[PDB]
Design a protein around this ligand. Structure first.
Ligand SMILES: O=C(NCCN1CCOCC1)c1ccc2c(c1)C(=O)c1ccc(Nc3ccc(F)c(NC(=O)c4ccccc4)c3)cc1CC2
Ligand SMILES: CCCCCCCCO[C@@H]1O[C@H](CO)[C@@H](O)[C@H](O)[C@H]1O
Ligand SMILES: CCCCCCCCO[C@@H]1O[C@H](CO)[C@@H](O)[C@H](O)[C@H]1O
Length: 327
């Protein structure tokens, strides 16, 4: 197609004519109208995609991830393009996705949602996670600003498989062997916040974050302590004034409360999974076991490769070129 060129976010964006009305939304992404499909779309121009091995692999990962994900509650690739006509001139990558029009913070505006609205919202998050997790992909930094939401409150998860208020405690402690339920922790934090209008653990800093979590969920149990090898870390922990798991309750729906108690567990092996959460009574209104799909297997064999820049770049080119838009 025919491209045109335009100054946006401090650079020259060169895009096909189909895409019009480009205007910045954030850290880079523009909102636009795809005149060809009649959809509002987000167009993301990658910064310095092939600068280094690390940038190149990250560019490739993003494209691979977005190509793979085909689910209503997960952002997916509507188009990818480049101004370049060949490999050698290939230096820019643009990704095009649905434009939802707001993130979850924009929907909450520090206000309590009704229990029914929380249901619908959390349901969709979990439905997206089941899918993501079924491909052995973990978000790791799930939060309201990564959840894109339209007027109808249909929700899509952004930026999976790559501010500490939604983070699993083990990630903050650089545990290194993360299980999928790190995202579940995040889910409970978001859920509590939808229901109260207030951040569940608004830590002032790293150590304060861990403190607020400890105070609510209580000090680590015996089984959990068994799984920590450092004597000094156990020493610290068990020398603290010992601390009960406070009552989560304290007019919320008791089913919400129960679900939250099963998400917000220090021990990640004991947290409820996305699929178990979707079957929890809290979601009786929305749960449909025959429309909570899994993903096709995802070829992640690239993650373990150490390749040269030119190969990362060529692999990316090849994916731009093979790209087939959805229905
Ligand atoms: O339309 C918005 N307008 C803001 C200005 N106002 C105008 C009108 O009034 C209200 C809004 C708006 C405001 C906020 C948001 C979106 C849109 C949104 O749809 C939206 C859509 C996409 C997006 N990010 C995005 C875009 C393209 C991508 F390729 C990615 N990449 C990833 O998600 C990703 C996935 C896997 C690995 C790595 C990255 C992410 C980020 C947002 C941010 C939330
Ligand atoms: C504030 C201090 C509490 C930190 C306790 C974190 C417990 C995390 O849970 C742990 O997750 C690891 C996966 O990352 C698993 O390997 C361990 O089996 C599991 O116990
Ligand atoms: C207030 C925060 C103090 C909590 C101390 C947690 C330190 C956990 O340390 C973790 O233990 C795991 C199992 O032994 C190891 O696999 C990880 O390498 C290590 O990070």
């Amino acid at each position: 197609p025919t491209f045109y060129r335009q100054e946006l976010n401090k650079t020259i964006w060169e895009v096909p004519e189909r895409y019009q009305n480009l205007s910045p939304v954030g850290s880079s992404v523009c909102a636009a109208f795809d005149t060809k499909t009649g959809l509002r779309v987000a167009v993301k121009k990658l910064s310095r995609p092939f600068q280094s091995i690390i940038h190149a692999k990250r560019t490739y990962r993003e494209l691979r991830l977005l190509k793979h994900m085909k689910h209503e509650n997960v952002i997916g690739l509507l188009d990818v393009f480049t101004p370049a006509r060949s490999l050698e001139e290939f230096n820019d990558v643009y990704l095009v996705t649905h434009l939802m029009g707001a993130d979850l913070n924009n929907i909450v505006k520090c206000q309590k949602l009704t229990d029914d609205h929380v249901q619908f919202l959390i349901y969709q998050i979990l439905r997206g996670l089941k899918y993501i997790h079924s491909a052995d992909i973990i978000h790791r930094d799930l939060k309201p600003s990564n959840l894109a939401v339209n007027e109808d409150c249909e929700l899509k998860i952004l930026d999976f498989g790559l501010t500490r208020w939604y983070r699993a405690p083990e990630i903050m402690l650089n545990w290194m062997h993360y299980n999928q339920t790190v995202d579940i922790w995040s889910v409970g934090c978001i859920m509590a916040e939808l229901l109260t209008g207030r951040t569940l653990f608004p830590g002032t800093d790293h150590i304060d974050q861990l403190k607020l979590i400890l105070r609510l969920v209580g000090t680590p149990g015996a089984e959990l302590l068994k799984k920590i090898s450092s004597e000094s870390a156990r020493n610290y922990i068990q020398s603290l004034t010992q601390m009960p798991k406070m009552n989560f309750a304290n007019g919320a729906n008791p089913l919400a409360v129960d679900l939250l108690e099963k998400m917000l567990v220090l021990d990640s092996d004991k947290r409820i999974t996305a699929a178990q959460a979707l079957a929890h009574a809290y979601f009786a209104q929305y749960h449909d076991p025959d429309d909570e799909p899994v993903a096709d297997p995802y070829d992640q064999s690239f993650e373990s490769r150490d390749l040269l820049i030119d190969e990362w770049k060529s692999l990316t080119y090849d994916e731009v070129i093979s790209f087939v838009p959805p229905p």
